[PDB]
Amino acid sequence: IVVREADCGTTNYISVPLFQPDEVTRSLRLRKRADIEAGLYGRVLAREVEVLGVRLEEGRYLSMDDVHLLIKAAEAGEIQEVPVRSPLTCQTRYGVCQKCYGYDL
């Protein structure tokens, strides 16, 4: 597996949940910050998101400030999941593309 091109032109994505179905209380509770950061940081937005008066455009890499803004919006009940590009939905043969992988940690 090697990063072999810039963009594969796919339209598929995955949705990263922000809430977890707690079982003891039978309710949806916010996930921990470290768990949210481990699945969102340095990832390319697949669709456009509008939260807290800020427009995040499609094709934007998510910095740690963006991830913290998304968590703030979840606490205010404005967003439940984030659509992002992932290697699971990349269409490059023998590897992945730059937009589906994201940032170099």
Partner 1 sequence: FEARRPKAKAVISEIDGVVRIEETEEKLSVFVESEGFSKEYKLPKEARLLVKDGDYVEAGQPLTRGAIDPHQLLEAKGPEAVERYLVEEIQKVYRAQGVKLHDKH
CB of 23 to partner 1, least distance (A): 7
Binding mask 73-92 for Zn ion (x = CB under 5 A): -----------------x--
Asked if 3 interacts with partner 1 (CB under 8 A), we say no
What minimum distance in Å lies between the beta carbon of 5 and Zn ion? 8
> Does the annotation flag 9 for ligand binding?
no
Q: How far apart are CA 83 and CA 21, in angstroms?
A: 19
Q: Which residue among 46, 70, 82, 101 contacts partner 1 (CB under 8 A)?
A: 101
The reply on whether position 39 binds partner 1 by CB under 8 A is yes
Shortest CB 57 distance to Zn ion, Å:
18
Closest by CA to 10, choosing from 97, 104, 73, is 97
Measured from the Cβ of residue 69, the count of other Cβ atoms closer than 10 Å reads 17
DSSP E strand stretches across the chain? 2-5, 14-17, 19-22, 27-30, 49-51, 54-56, 81-84, 95-97
